Amino acid sequence: PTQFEERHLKFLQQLGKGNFGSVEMCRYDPLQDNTGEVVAVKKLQHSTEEHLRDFEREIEILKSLQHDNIVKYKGVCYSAGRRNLKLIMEYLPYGSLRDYLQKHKERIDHIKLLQYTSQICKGMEYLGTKRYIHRNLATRNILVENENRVKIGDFGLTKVLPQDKEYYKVKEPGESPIFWYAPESLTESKFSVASDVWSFGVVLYELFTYIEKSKSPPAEFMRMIGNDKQGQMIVFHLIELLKNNGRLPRPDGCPDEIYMIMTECWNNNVNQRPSFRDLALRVDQIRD
């Protein structure tokens, strides 16, 4: 059931749009009926040949993944009479963990936060087994299936390690989520499981802020660097702050033991950052 016909793939709702991609909720009814299944469809926006090649790689990555905490691949639609490509995924009703945390604060306490943490770690452990580097871990990129299950959604930025190295060097990017980046990613464009672990620390910070507006990583880092500055000088200041131990603060209400996990992920010493496997084991112990 891996190939979906464009004639039966009906638009329902916008789910998230960027400069280079869009995801929509759609209904797939091939028995032309109503019983058809609801899916999520990712398509490029402002597509180029190079972006299409990248998208094919992103599709093959998601298809290669089978895990409870990773959005389920369903197939591809070769749309415009088989002259274009769209990616078909399962549909997750509850949106992004960022939006969910903000809307449903009153049924989320600390143990629930840590249940999400743990599930994120486990998806990340699984990604590690395929030598994939996510490069974009953020609560906006984590999806909520139900109150008991979250899933890493979006592999737009994901790279596969060379078979002979432990790091991937990106030259290209331009625009990047700099406030979630490890310092060597900012300085050297080097990406690794260790840099994913750094980003994971920032995700843990996001959770314990419960998405209160002025507590976001960009809001905080810009407070710290000076919310006056503009263009490159922002990145200059961020690198300098990080290299010399400026860090996000402990959120209000966050236990020491949980902030400590964050600060250990935020190690400038790449080789001393914890593994996703020891993070899962730690978090699971704090949860009991």
Ligand SMILES: O=C(Nc1ccc(-c2ccnc(Nc3ccc(N4CCOCC4)cc3)n2)cc1)[C@H]1CCCN1
């Ligand atoms: O948005 C992105 N990626 C993305 C990846 C996967 C999904 C996805 C895959 C499966 N289910 C859902 N569910 C979902 C349900 C509701 C909502 N919302 C959106 C607005 O408010 C209602 C809840 C968002 C996602 N979303 C959504 C977006 C990336 C690519 C374009 C820009 N940034």
